[PDB]
Design a protein around this ligand. Sequence first.
Ligand SMILES: Nc1ncnc2c1ncn2[C@@H]1O[C@H](COP(=O)(O)OP(=O)(O)OP(=O)(O)O)[C@@H](O)[C@H]1O
Ligand SMILES: [Ca+2]
Ligand SMILES: [Zn+2]
Lengths: 149, 424
Amino acid sequence: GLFAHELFYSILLFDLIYREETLFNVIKSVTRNGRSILLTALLALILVYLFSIVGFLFLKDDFILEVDRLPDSTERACDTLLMCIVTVMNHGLRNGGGVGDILRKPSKDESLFPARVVYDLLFFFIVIIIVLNLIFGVIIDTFADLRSE
Amino acid sequence: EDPLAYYENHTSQIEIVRQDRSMEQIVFPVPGICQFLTEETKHRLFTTTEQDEQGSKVSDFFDQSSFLHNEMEWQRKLRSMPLIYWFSRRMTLWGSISFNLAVFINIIIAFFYPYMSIRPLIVALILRSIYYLGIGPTLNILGALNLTNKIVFVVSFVGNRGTFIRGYKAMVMDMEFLYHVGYILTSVLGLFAHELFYSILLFDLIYREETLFNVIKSVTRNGRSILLTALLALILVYLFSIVGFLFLKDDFILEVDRLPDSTERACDTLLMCIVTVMNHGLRNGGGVGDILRKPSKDESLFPARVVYDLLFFFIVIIIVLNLIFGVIIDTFADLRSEKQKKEEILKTTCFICGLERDKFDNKTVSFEEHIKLEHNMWNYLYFIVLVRVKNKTDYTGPESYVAQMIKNKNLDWFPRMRAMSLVS
Ligand SMILES: Nc1ncnc2c1ncn2[C@@H]1O[C@H](COP(=O)(O)OP(=O)(O)OP(=O)(O)O)[C@@H](O)[C@H]1O
Ligand SMILES: [Ca+2]
Ligand SMILES: [Zn+2]
């Protein structure tokens, strides 16, 4: 920080964890079963990978994403499986409703509307409501175990 | 080389309770077939047996005695056969290699599809294969290696676990065997039908990692409650859709993007209104009010719309949806408590007689000595095998009583809540 750049001093703010036992105890909930948390994250990644495979195979056209260009307004995001995986992981996981939010809004007259509905609801329930909540459940269980010990 | 050492190592002792309710000590020579038993099976039996209503594991141990004996026989035969022994011993190696291969093939498929420690060294080899032969040839070679290794692994598995010993029907019955056959089928489909079929193999992480299986057990143990809560949510969504169709139909206008108007009505039929509510209100954080049309204040239905949206939010989004997470959280604690209780019992109680550690305090024999020498479940198993093997004519006094009790299915010859040393 002294000899290279002033913004390097920002890392020193982490000393609060060392100083305060309360914050350290709180973080111990995350750290004690961090392996469980990471395994749950890996399971989420695998499920996202399978969903991306399904979308690429059958729902490719619906993957249209808007973009802002520095000095068209839409780009296809499922031309390649890596692109589709990146889109799903980045947007569906972060969005409250899942992939259906980013995916194009389907008309009722369209034949694949039931398939799209099932796809979105399955993603929401399997990933957003169950898999993602398991990490928080693990953290709470670690809290309880630490308290009991 | 010491005869006394050999005999001491090959001699065993047990304590039995006779018909007159008196305890006696039986010293017997360890049967030869006993040495072939596997440490893995011993650990599994020790850590997996479940207490009965009365709190004794002796019943289940005696029940599994026969499977243990058959396993010992097939262990002797397997050691007799040389080549299969080498494959059987290294079961973990095949599984680890198969898992690494699955991970690598899936990584390549994800990164390149559509196209056209020694782990770092293997990664370098794969990279060179991609650079020289190409993505497709590298994937083909990796898949062939995976299939060959999975065949080796299934052979090693059937050899080690001896599932067939119970019978072909039992072998098919075993769920782990079916999982391995499903893995083989998935590998074949990946190799021949389509490359994307290799994705399903990534589920092997759950099987490999016990921690991830424990995490998923929170979802699966009380999963019926979760499905019932989902059904309750569906019922409430159905009622809300009925209300919307009857009174708030016009507000159900949803924007639509069309492939080559900008809005469409979504509550012209009750099925469609249900689909709209279930698909959109549940996924949206606020609820159905988010998708529904924004009401102007001057409109007469604004007070009704406010109540509709807030009631949906509180009943469905806040309460019903949170009940599933509450169920998962409660299952976590239930599993933790069960595990802790089982561990405490296993650590602090005798397997056979069930006496606690504290009872042995300030005594000549420690609890460790009691479990090691006085009461050894493996010594009891050895005695049972001795009774089975020995000819009826040569039975001794105690052996005859134990054999008769075994035939009559009476488990009172085991000592329960009694130890000779504690008595005197
Ligand atoms: N009745 C019992 N209650 C509690 N623990 C038991 C009981 N019987 C055996 N054990 C434990 O089961 C494990 C298996 O004991 P075992 O006689 O195989 O020990 P070992 O040290 O591997 O053998 P060895 O010294 O004869 O080569 C040991 O931890 C023993 O303490
Ligand atoms: Ca005789
Ligand atoms: Zn005992």
